[PDB]
# Entry
Amino acid sequence: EDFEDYEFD
Amino acid sequence: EDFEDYEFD
Amino acid sequence: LVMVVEYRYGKAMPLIFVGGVPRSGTTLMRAMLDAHPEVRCGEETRIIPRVLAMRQAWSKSGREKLRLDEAGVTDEVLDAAMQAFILEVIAKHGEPARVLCNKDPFTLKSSVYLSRLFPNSKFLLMVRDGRASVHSMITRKVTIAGFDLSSYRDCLTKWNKAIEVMYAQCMEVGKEKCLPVYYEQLVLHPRRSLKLILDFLGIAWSDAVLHHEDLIGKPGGVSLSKIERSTDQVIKPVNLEALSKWTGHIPGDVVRDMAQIAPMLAQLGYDPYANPPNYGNPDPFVINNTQRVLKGD
Amino acid sequence: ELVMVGVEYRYGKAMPLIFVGGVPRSGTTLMRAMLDAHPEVRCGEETRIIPRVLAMRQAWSKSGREKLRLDEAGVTDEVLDAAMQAFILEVIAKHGEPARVLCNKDPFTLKSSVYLSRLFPNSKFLLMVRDGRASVHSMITRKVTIAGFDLSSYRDCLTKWNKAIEVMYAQCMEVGKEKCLPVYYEQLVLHPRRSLKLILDFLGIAWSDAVLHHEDLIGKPGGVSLSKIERSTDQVIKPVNLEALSKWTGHIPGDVVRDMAQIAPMLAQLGYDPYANPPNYGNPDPFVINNTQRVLKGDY
Ligand SMILES: Nc1ncnc2c1ncn2[C@@H]1O[C@H](COP(=O)(O)O)[C@@H](OP(=O)(O)O)[C@H]1O
Ligand SMILES: Nc1ncnc2c1ncn2[C@@H]1O[C@H](COP(=O)(O)O)[C@@H](OP(=O)(O)O)[C@H]1O
# Structure
């Protein structure tokens, strides 16, 4: 919970 | 969209 | 230029990008490639997807792009900067090998761009029944920013748009450079599948890709992050357990609206109304592997 | 070592970079223009993407948990830094013309000067410093947007100017005398010759007269590239002039005038008297006086 397991867009 | 002259401080 | 036979890393080098929507067999795929003495993928870098998303942002935004252009930070400069950042992360985060590889699930949203930046890279896109990918992320709580784990409909809806993008990019890159790999086909027929993949990659057969789990912790072998969510699954051999655990866990309204929520399912050959599709017949190899996993080997 | 032609200039992690910065509206564009005018030096426009990548990399080390996962992935400090080094250097080297000495100006990069110093061990830093009342008056009346600053409030903008420079100045001090030099905007404006002599020394660049003639080199080979949509451009096309030092006075709400010492304790610490409203910044060289008369005559 400053970063999730994944991200993008 | 959140455009500003300086975006990171 | 030097990673450290002395392999030098550079824009023109042969490169393998593995990806797809998370919980689609991407770690398994890269662990099987890692098993090959001439290939290294290693763990998810995490930061490569971030710099790409950044890049994809400064493109759409007109006001921002205009400002960068007028500063001389053109496509030429951004691309050179991206290239160098990526090469460094890929090249320096694991042991060296003739063929370098990266698996970070979402990188495959920018395969068109990545192919432009690395003109000799190839791409393996993992494809898995969205219903299986989603049920995986909800029950195991693998978090993706912007997917709502409290809703099958939402996660399905966002699996759909994610894989729509990745598939389109895979088609534009062309069939010489991007191969869709169906998780369920890889599990059902490892050897047939890995035969086609390696061929496509221009790399030679090795029985080691069929024994990835014997190479965990070993050198030139497969390195696993103990925090990565897939790790407890990749320690086992290719097995059949996870194919259709999703069946019956989909809310009835999502079952009704499946084709509308996830039109990519029918596009990629998954009948959105089979619960579950018949994915095929298991090779004796994975039948036996499955049997060892149940006893606890 | 990447190479560019335009003899052939060779650039690498160990080259001498100049990093200019400070709180925006502090004379940073002027300072880098004056350096761009040296034939040996190119700074060029604000890249924007460098403070952006620096923010990102900052977040990653700031979270203990994210740091752990990166380490476990083999993405260690050394790997991050190498990727940063490489990323930042491509942007600096290629966003404008090539030149013996390379320079960058993105105002808040200076919040990261200990880091950049580590990454580029022969780079030096010019921290532009200007009376925050001047910068805040500037950002407010010109509507120059800075993330988190509320332009409807002088008290808020000065409160945040204060925090920004406290951090930037702490960094400057920590890299030390040999590597970071504070440059006062007002002393630069009143005394450009002496300022640039001291600045070029500190940087170990031979003097050149063209630093005092930046306005004759706009758009010119080896000269000063201006973006037409950066907010400082209409000011920097003129020669160093006097108009902007003190014009803030009397446009600050009385309550803020009154609290100036609670609000911006960095004023005192930097040598601006918070109750002097305005301070005596000093007396101009005839050179600057003449430049200013030329401006009023309308030669620009
Ligand atoms: N040895 C193996 N045999 C079959 N499937 C495997 C496997 N190791 C991992 N997988 C599957 O790959 C999925 C995760 O893919 P990704 O690496 O893209 O997250 C997991 O699905 P489940 O969570 O449904 O089990 C996992 O079970
Ligand atoms: N030729 C020149 N002589 C004196 N000051 C100058 C100048 N060119 C720019 N400046 C000053 O630098 C300030 C902008 O700094 P930065 O580029 O860091 O934003 C502006 O202050 P004002 O807005 O008060 O006029 C501007 O006037």
